[PDB]
Design a protein around this ligand. Structure first.
Ligand SMILES: [Zn+2]
Ligand SMILES: [Zn+2]
Ligand SMILES: [Zn+2]
Lengths: 135, 78, 93, 815, 59, 70, 407
């Protein structure tokens, strides 16, 4: 209503805690830039970009399969929780993606068969994006 | 005269916070304030926020929000 | 049509379907992606009503489901979805 | 007046024979007038209709509800009628029907709550020493029910007195039976009162009446079973007399004592279990060698329970129990009974579960070659269950020899056919797996011999054997024998019996599933033309198996058939996509997907769109389903432009078909439809602004399925654009159209957010026009029931007036 | 009440209760001589179906 | 590693030349040090004016001891 | 732009802390709730250090948390209330080091809603019923049971709805193997909405209501309902059955009250105040949290005020009536969100902000000359005590916490 020209939203994400700090910086020597945030609960997290399309498609599939095979522990829907006030837009949840390493070997085998890989190969791709930006 | 559609609409009118064409501004806003207070008590970091802003303890803030739920917005008209 | 939903608080009983309406959603009549298991209330699963079809009332041979669209819109969170015939009596059709 | 009160209690006829609304109204009326009516006339009218012989279960349930509601209002005004109520409903506690018992229990509970404990005791007391067993039985059951309703501590003193009475051993018997029925009815909720119940009944094990001793042992067994696994400190003063008594007694009393021992032993720790098991096992062998059927049925259960505890040793079991057990318990008279048969099989499986499969199987294998069909059947059941639970990791040579010899002989000599031998054969060979290489030749010879003749039920059994054994028949590095039996199967394809045909089709499918599509002896080029006319059969088993076989062929071996034949098969399968059976429907969907992937969309979609126009409704649904399947298997990139050219044709009844197709297509493809919203938006913009109501209804259906199918992928721009065209239709008087528009709006809520919907809706909530207000409050109530908590962040700021405060200040706080 | 075992067992058949019966009889008589507590929300309140039927009847 | 503060911190900035921090700390419902000291003095004198045997003074012990607010 | 979310340091604030034998052995652990994280902690009795065994993200909002076990069991279960319309029961598996979900029953819609339950959780002390409640109008009760394999069993829920009613706190009442009871602080607002003069809003009272669950008849009865003199926050379950009477303590502003149904009269004790307090004279005092400890011989309560002062509370009884309430200054600690008293004499304090602390209880039964306050003392005015450094507690451990980060 105010001005004629309007800005576009290109990203939406519910974090779960109230953020009071945001900064774009590099955290490790010889690493890439992240967006760092801190919450009112004492949490520190980062938001990092994908390098290629093929990386982004792999993590999307992992998140899509863990949403059904490893659903949240208190009966919430993951997509619904991340769409709390606005629908999620262009963010993958690596906290869910990294619960792969805590699953039972049967479920790890099934999910790796679905992704056409080996469980050690899935675990190694997760560690690779983490050590590229943060520790 | 008993259809599923008129059973759905009657059950919607039973959900507290729902209105009709004779709902007043006072009723609408009282509903808004009541579920705002319930949501502040539900979400932990909104309550942390308010407890830091007004230098009070969390139990005190919860008790105050509960006391404000009986008559928010003042008394009605007429 | 004198048909409503039960809409009472559902418990631990599981809804069944006869072989005519077997793979349908008990809410929207769709056949795409059965997602969530149907619970009915304790009154609608009692005595001679135990194991009957949720939709029509015939003999049940499989479990009833909510489709994915109804699950997404949270239509599984209302009451018992059994269809009640208001135009007739208990031991009627 | 007395003649009028029945005329008013016609409310009962209203309650029994009436619709739900009349029933609820009359229920209300009677529950508000119960006190004025009184307990006299109410029950004087309800009880005859309750003990009527033409009552049905649902009317009995309704009458139970009425009795509950009137007993809630009349609380002590029923004391002069408790005896009449009990005389009428003391049966229904021992009825054969299960729900009669439940309803009788509810009535007795509500009555015991309305009256007092003292009234119930004073009314039910005299029928405790009544010399009719039936009456004493029902009195004990009713006393257990009032105990469950009013708590055990309320009835503990009455029981403490009645179980120690000095004048009537019948009264003592009835009191101990009451304790037993309490245990049975209440279950593990007796554990806080175990010590008190055991202390009340423990003096009965040494009574001078044998009937009293027996009921005391049975009550101890019931309490132990209810308490399992907790509670053994409360059974000591019985532990000593019970073992003395099993060493002293003989007969029924001994049977009850041993049953109690058997329930108590799994409650103990290791040393106690071992010791008490040694004693009971000595006398238990003496009873192994016994005539009585009930005694043997008890003894089997006691052995099963003892040998399942932790303290009892596998070595002790092997050396002491197994020899006399297998000596006295495995014979044809044991095979002839039924209940004892089922108990013996379970006891033997569970004995194996602790002693090792080798011991049991090596002890009962040689009986697989016996002159008794029932004995062979029982041995096969036992071996199959054991090898299904434990496996074959411990089986060795000279034991597989006997196993295979026996199962082959038992399959061959089987005169009456039943699935026991089939499932035993299957389980044994699939548990062996790779290890049965040297036996497959004579196995296959036997299967071929059974398949070549013998009345077609032998043939169907052999076909099922092939079905469940082909996987191990190939994974054992073997293909020539399965190729040969596949040839002789393919020769059996014109049959008079549909259930045998289904089985041979299943065996063929299992073969083609595991054997290569190459390297195969019966050629696909000759198989499929034989398969095609079977697609017209109407037996469900034949249809499902045939379609699944054709699907497997089209999946793995598409490069052996011509696109012409694939086209014919597609058009023959088309109408089965709406078949009445779920299995046929899913099989047809899969097969159509495989065939469409085999050939391609270009010429199939041509004929599909062709017959979109010239078909009527019942045949159009299958065409819509087929179009959606083609778009799912071969990307909708190849389907959408051709489908929109069909809309470009200036004709209603064609544009509607295109719209229905698009709706079901987006609903079926789901999240894949996120790349194709922009391509379809112009058609939908034209369709949502159209004079024909069906156009707008179907276009709103399309929007709903698109928006729900893409959720969490970021198409908010496209869906906002479409929301602009959906909204003008909310002022629609037509029911189905407004119902489609509301569903589209609820789907767009999920896809876009409650914020944008609230922004559209805030315009007319306080419009001067009552019609606008009606419509907008409907939309708002939908948005409010769905996502009530997300709206806390999206409400607009409303300012304080003179009298009322409307600003939310906490949200204005700054840190 | 049915079990082939129950039939087998129930087939072979051929002061403290007074000090309790007396008091029980007296207490019962006193209870009887009285004319000669939690509320139940469900029984006294209309259900959703009852409310819907009432609304339809009203309009 | 932690460095204690007096009130609740809201913002800080960094001085580019020296890399020093400039912090502002604020609390609602609070007393400043001067207000606290004068309140303590006032309470002490309104105690010392109780008019009751004055020989035993709790005021001098009230003024000297202070409880650590952390 | 396409982004990826990774947590570096998880949240350290605490909302709820419960304690029990969750691994099944004789050790005691603590299950804490961060905001959206569930955590299991084990303090060592020999070193006094607290270790973290397990941390899980639940991707929701935890609103309530309770423990229970069944008669005869040696392992404790976990019940969670959240912002899903579900109630879940969890069990810890030590051999796998994971939380296994035992049961999950659905009753409504998602989000921190106003009339969907999830905000209050009450459990029967004997472990055979659990209530879950909303802030307005809706209460559900489930019945807990067991089979011969000792596996939990849950039933279909029973409704205890009440229109135009607000709930402050719900608590299970310790009756000993009688029918289960629940006690709530309620407030009906139906008349304050119809009075333009605003004096139905004034002089509207808070009630205390007792809900009885008939296990044999399978329904809920509202048994007792009594108005209160002043409004209270939370209730406290007094140990009953054979180890005490069976009532509740009502914590109000400036007072604490004991109540019970029957012939028991109400007993009130004012909350003592700091002598020479520099606070604003117009403020009242409330209790912010509590903890119960029950030995084989006696029981006591620990309760903390808004200033951090803990008071030890005991009850003087006769055959079955309570006659007096005694209060006594224990120690001063930072204001806590929850505190647990462990066997082996340790007090865990989860502070509402900042670092957490584990203390060792050095002295119970007091060899000192500080005064005790009581409800039987005549008073025209309030009680006055003097705060002092730690005397009964000894700091043993301290858990770092970054909450809250403001910049
Ligand atoms: Zn549906
Ligand atoms: Zn129902
Ligand atoms: Zn049906």
């Amino acid at each position: 209503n105010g001005a004629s020209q309007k800005a576009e939203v290109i990203m939406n994400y519910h974090v779960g805690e109230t953020v009071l700090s945001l900064q774009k910086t590099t955290l490790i020597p010889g690493g890439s830039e992240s967006l760092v945030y801190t919450t009112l609960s004492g949490g520190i997290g980062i938001l990092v970009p994908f390098t290629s399309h093929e990386d982004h498609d792999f993590f999307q599939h992992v998140e899509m399969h863990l949403r059904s095979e490893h659903p949240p522990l208190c009966g919430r829907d993951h997509l619904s929780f991340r769409s709390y006030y606005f629908p999620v837009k262009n963010v993958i949840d690596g906290d869910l993606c990294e619960q792969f390493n805590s699953m039972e070997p049967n479920k790890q085998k099934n999910v790796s068969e679905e992704l056409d890989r080996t469980p050690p190969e899935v675990s190694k791709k997760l560690e690779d994006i983490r050590t590229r930006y943060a520790f | 005269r008993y259809t599923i559609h008129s059973q759905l609409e009657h059950l919607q009118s039973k959900y507290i916070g729902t209105g009709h064409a004779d709902t007043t501004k006072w009723e609408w806003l009282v509903n808004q304030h009541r579920d705002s207070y319930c949501s502040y008590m539900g979400h932990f970091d909104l309550l942390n926020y308010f407890a830091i802003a007004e230098n009070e303890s969390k139990a005190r803030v919860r008790f105050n929000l509960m006391e404000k739920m009986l008559q928010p917005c003042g008394p009605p008209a007429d | 049509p004198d048909l409503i939903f039960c809409r009472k608080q559902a418990g631990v009983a599981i809804g069944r379907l006869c072989e005519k309406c077997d793979g349908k959603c008990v809410i929207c009549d769709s056949y795409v992606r059965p997602c969530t298991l149907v619970r009915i209330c304790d009154e609608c699963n009692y005595g001679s009503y135990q194991g009957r079809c949720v939709i029509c009332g015939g003999p049940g041979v499989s479990d009833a489901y909510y489709c994915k669209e109804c699950t997404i819109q949270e239509k599984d969170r209302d009451g018992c979805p059994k269809i009640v015939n208001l135009g007739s009596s208990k031991t009627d059709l | 007046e007395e003649q009028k009160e029945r005329k008013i209690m016609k409310l009962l006829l209203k309650i029994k024979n009436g619709t739900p609304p009349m029933r609820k109204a009359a229920l209300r009326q009677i529950t508000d007038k119960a006190r004025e009516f009184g307990a006299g006339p109410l029950f004087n009218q309800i009880l005859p209709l309750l003990m009527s012989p033409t009552l049905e279960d649902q009317e009995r349930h309704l009458l139970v509800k009425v009795i509950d509601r009137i007993l809630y209002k009349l609380d002590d005004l029923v004391r002069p009628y408790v005896h009449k109520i009990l005389v009428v409903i003391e049966p229904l506690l021992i009825d054969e029907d299960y729900y009669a018992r439940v309803e009788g229990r509810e009535i007795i509970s509500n009555l015991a709550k309305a009256a007092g404990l003292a009234t119930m005791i004073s009314t039910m007391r005299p029928d405790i020493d009544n010399m009719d067993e039936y009456v004493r039985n029902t009195t004990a059951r009713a006393f257990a029910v009032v105990a469950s309703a009013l708590g055990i501590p309320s009835l503990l003193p009455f029981l403490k007195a009645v179980c120690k009475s000095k004048k009537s051993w019948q009264a003592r018997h009835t009191g101990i039976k009451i304790v037993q029925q309490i245990a049975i009815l209440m279950g593990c909720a007796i554990l806080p009162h175990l010590r008190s119940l055991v202390e009340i009944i423990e003096h009965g094990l040494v009574d001078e009446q044998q009937k009293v001793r027996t009921i005391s042992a049975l009550a101890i067994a019931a309490l132990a079973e209810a308490a399992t696994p907790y509670g053994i400190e409360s059974f000591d003063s019985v532990l000593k007399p019970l073992w003395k008594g099993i060493r002293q007694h003989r007969g029924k009393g001994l049977a009850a004592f041993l049953k109690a021992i058997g329930y108590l032993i799994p409650l103990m720790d290791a040393e106690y279990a071992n010791y008490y098991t040694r004693e009971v096992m000595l006398i238990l062998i003496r009873e192994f060698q016994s005539p009585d059927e009930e005694m043997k049925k008890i003894v089997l259960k006691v052995v099963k329970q003892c040998c399942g505890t932790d303290g009892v040793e596998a070595n002790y079991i092997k050396t002491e129990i197994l020899p006399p057990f297998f000596k006295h318990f495995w014979q044809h008279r044991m095979a002839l009974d039924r209940r004892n048969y089922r108990q013996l099989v379970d006891t033997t499986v569970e004995l194996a579960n602790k002693v090792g499969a080798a011991e049991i199987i090596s002890r009962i294998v040689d009986d697989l070659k016996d002159e008794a069909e029932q004995y062979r059947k029982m041995v096969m059941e036992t071996i199959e269950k054991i090898m299904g639970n434990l496996g074959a990791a411990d089986i060795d040579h000279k034991l597989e020899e006997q196993l295979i010899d026996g199962i082959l002989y038992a399959f061959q000599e089987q005169t009456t056919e039943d699935s026991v031998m089939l499932n035993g054969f299957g389980t044994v060979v699939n548990a062996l797996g790779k290890r049965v290489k040297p036996y497959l030749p004579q196995i296959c010879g036997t299967v071929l011999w059974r398949l070549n003749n013998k009345s077609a039920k032998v043939r169907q059994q052999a076909a099922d054997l092939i079905s469940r054994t082909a996987v191990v028949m190939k994974t054992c590095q073997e293909e020539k024998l399965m190729g040969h039996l596949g040839v002789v199967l393919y020769e059996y394809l014109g049959e008079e019996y549909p259930e045998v045909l289904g089985s041979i089709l299943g065996a063929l499918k299992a073969i083609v599933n595991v054997i290569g599509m190459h390297k195969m002896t019966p050629p696909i080029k000759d198989l499929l033309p034989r398969l095609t006319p079977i697609l017209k059969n109407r037996h469900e088993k034949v249809q499902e198996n045939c379609i699944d076989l054709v699907g497997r062929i089209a999946d793995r071996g598409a490069e052996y058939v011509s696109a012409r034949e694939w086209m014919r098969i597609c058009f023959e399968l088309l109408e089965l996509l709406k078949a009445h059976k779920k299995a046929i429907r899913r099989a047809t969907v899969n097969t159509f997907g495989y065939i469409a992937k085999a050939i391609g969309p270009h010429d199939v979609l041509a004929t599909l769109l062709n017959n979109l126009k010239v078909q009527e409704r019942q045949n159009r649904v299958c065409t819509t389903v087929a179009i959606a399947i083609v778009a799912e298997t071969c990307s909708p990139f190849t389907v959408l432009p051709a489908l929109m050219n069909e809309y470009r044709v200036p004709e209603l009844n064609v544009q509607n078909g295109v719209l229905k197709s698009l709706s079901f297509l987006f609903e079926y493809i789901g999240e894949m439809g996120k790349d194709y919203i922009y391509a379809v938006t112009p058609l939908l913009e034209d369709a949502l602004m159209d004079r024909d109501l069906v156009h707008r209804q179907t276009a709103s259906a399309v929007v709903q399925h698109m928006s729900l199918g893409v959720y969490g992928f970021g198409c908010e721009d496209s869906l906002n654009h479409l929301l602009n065209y959906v909204w003008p239709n909310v002022f629609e008087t037509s029911p189905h159209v407004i119902q489609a528009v509301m569903g589209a709006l609820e789907g767009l809520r999920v896809a876009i957010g409650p914020c944008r919907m609230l922004q559209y809706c805030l315009q007319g909530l306080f419009h001067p026009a009552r019609k606008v207000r009606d419509v907008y409050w409907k939309i708002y109530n939908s948005i409010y029931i769905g996502s009530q908590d997300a709206l806390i962040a999206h409400y607009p700021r409303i300012y304080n007036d003179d009298k009322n405060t409307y600003i939310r200040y906490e949200l204005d706080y700054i840190l | 009440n049915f079990d082939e075992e129950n039939a087998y067992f129930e087939d072979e058949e051929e002061d403290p209760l007074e000090a309790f019966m007396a008091e029980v009889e007296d207490q019962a008589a006193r209870d009887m001589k009285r004319l000669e507590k939690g509320i139940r929300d469900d029984i006294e309140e209309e259900d959703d179906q009852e409310a819907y039927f009432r609304y339809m009847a009203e309009n | 590693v932690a460095f204690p503060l007096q009130y609740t911190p809201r913002k800080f900035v960094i001085h580019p030349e020296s890399n020093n921090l400039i912090i502002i700390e604020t609390d609602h419902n609070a007393y400043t040090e001067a207000t606290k000291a004068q309140r303590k003095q006032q309470m002490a004198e309104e105690m010392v004016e109780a008019a009751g045997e004055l020989a035993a003074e709790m005021a001098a012990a009230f003024l000297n001891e202070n409880l650590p607010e952390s | 732009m396409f982004l990826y979310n990774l947590t570096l340091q998880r949240a350290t604030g605490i909302s709820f802390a419960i304690h029990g034998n969750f691994s099944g052995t004789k050790q005691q652990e603590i299950v804490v709730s961060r905001g959206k994280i569930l955590e299991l902690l084990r303090p060592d009795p020999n070193t006094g250090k607290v270790h973290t065994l397990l941390t899980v993200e639940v991707f929701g909002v935890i609103r309530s948390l309770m423990a229970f076990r069944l008669t005869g069991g040696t392992k404790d279960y976990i019940v969670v209330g959240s912002d899903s319309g579900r109630i879940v029961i969890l069990e810890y598996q030590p051999s796998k080091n994971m939380f296994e979900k035992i049961h999950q029953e659905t009753f409504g819609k998602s989000g921190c809603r106003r009339i969907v339950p999830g905000q209050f959780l009450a459990v029967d002390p004997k472990g055979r019923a659990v209530m879950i409640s909303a802030i307005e109008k809706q209460k559900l009760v489930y019945i807990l049971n067991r089979d011969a394999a000792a596996r939990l069993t849950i039933s279909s829920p029973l409704e205890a709805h009440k229109a135009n009613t607000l709930v402050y706190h719900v608590v299970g009442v310790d009756v000993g193997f009688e029918n289960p009871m629940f006690a709530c602080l309620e407030m009906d607002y139906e008349e304050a909405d119809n009075d333009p003069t605003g004096e139905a809003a004034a002089n509207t009272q808070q009630t205390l209501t007792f809900y009885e669950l008939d296990l044999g008849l399978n329904h809920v009865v509202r048994k007792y309902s009594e108005p209160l003199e002043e409004h209270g926050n939370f209730l406290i379950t007094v140990p009953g059955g054979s180890d005490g009477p069976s009532g509740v303590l009502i914590c109000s502003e400036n007072y604490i009250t004991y109540k019970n149904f029957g012939d028991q009269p109400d007993i009130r004790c004012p909350i003592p105040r700091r002598r020479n307090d520099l606070d604003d004279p117009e403020r009242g005092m409330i209790f912010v949290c509590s903890a119960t400890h029950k030995t084989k011989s006696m029981f006591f309560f620990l309760a903390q005020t808004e200033q951090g002062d803990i008071f030890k509370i005991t009850l003087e009884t006769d055959e079955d009536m309570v006659t007096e309430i005694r209060l006594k200054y224990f120690d001063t600690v930072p204001v806590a969100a929850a505190m647990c008293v462990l066997k082996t004499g340790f007090l865990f304090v989860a502070s509402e902000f900042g670092n957490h602390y584990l203390y060792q209880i050095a002295h119970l039964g007091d060899d000192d000359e500080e005064p005790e306050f009581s409800s039987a003392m005549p008073l025209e005015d309030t009680f006055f005590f003097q705060p002092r450094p730690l005397k009964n507690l000894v700091l043993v451990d301290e858990l770092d916490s970054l909450s809250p980060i403001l910049f």
